[PDB]
Point group: D2
Chain length 116, copies 4
């Protein structure tokens, strides 16, 4: 499990539960091919998106559906979503944790990258 | 006047200067059509991207080239760029200020939507 | 001129107005002596706290009353206030801008130290 | 273990290891009495600071020594430290996780509060 996503709600001070997350990988023809997807758990975490074998070198895009999250709570947010784009495993396989801290008009994203 | 971008450097504690910024508008076929662009000033600001007249309601993508910024500084970044996607709306305030706080492995983006 | 404070509201996406701010200077006996104070403007800014002449090198504490801000909005905050402690230094740039991005259960503070 | 602290380095994209953390509780005479302290682990986490019985209602101050952290890395940071002040357990016992995202000239602090 080399790719993990963690989302927190900065308004309620709690994990952001049931947030949809889509991952894409840039193709040779520079198109974004669907790679994996899922939803955050009660702890705001999304594990099991991919494997070490599948998670090859490449440029990935993790798109977090923050809009649906805020709308379900009765809030009209600014962003359509929070999307992280990055090159992965270009110096060998690494473990990535993409953390997103959400607010209606602001979000922060941090990457904690460790060598397995 | 209606759209401004401000970028700060959290490592050196100063405005992020000469950062490339491109704005796109989502087309009917869901592809991103180039709309406006430029580079941040000595104060880390980028104004005059569009006019009230040209900035119609729609989905806009603001792509900030954070990677080139850090690479020039000789610092190894994580993200390929910082992308801020949002829907421009007449119902809400007129002026949009997209502020991005940058760090090599983390970034935050906040919108300050005001009428005046 | 040498010290400015800017506060933003990440929930409503606007400047945080009428936020109480107090600045203290650490005394020889390590107690915090009141130095300057005021409230944020309609633009979420607070200028004219001190002069270059009065702002000598030393340890300063900037206490932002985030709790009263959220309570007035009828939103339950976590923090009692946001405290930014730092050492003013002549070796580095002259002007200090303390920016605080507020959310009920989270806040960020960045310093933009520039000479001009 | 109702009080946990987590610190991440936004420059390296890794946990902030060996960061000293001091906790204080406001006394009746409004002085800050030392409550507990420790250092972050290899995962950037600090557990075992207190217990449910000891962690009574009160106003607490968690002071994170970010200055020593950056100085050890050859960087002269802006903040003397990152200090969170908050009222705890005023609506019954809760579990608190204080997360701090660090950068030389900026830091964010988030509180994830759950009902045990
Ligand atoms: O566990 C984490 C929390 Br809580 C906050 C941030 Br930011 C990142 C991670 Br990983
Ligand atoms: O001027 C700004 C600062 Br400094 C920080 C953030 Br966040 C937004 C604005 Br506008």
């Amino acid at each position: 499990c080399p790719l993990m996503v963690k989302v927190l709600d900065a308004v309620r001070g709690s994990p952001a539960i049931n947030v949809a997350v889509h991952v894409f990988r840039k193709a040779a023809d520079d198109t974004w091919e669907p790679f994996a997807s899922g939803k955050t758990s009660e702890s705001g975490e999304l594990h099991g998106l991919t494997t070490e074998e599948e998670f090859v070198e490449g440029i990935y895009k993790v798109e977090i559906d923050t809009k649906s999250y805020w709308k379900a709570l009765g809030i009209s947010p600014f962003h359509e979503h929070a999307e992280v784009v990055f090159t992965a495993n270009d110096s060998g396989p690494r473990r990535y944790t993409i953390a997103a801290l959400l607010s209606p008009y602001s979000y922060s994203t941090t990457a904690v990258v460790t060598n397995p």
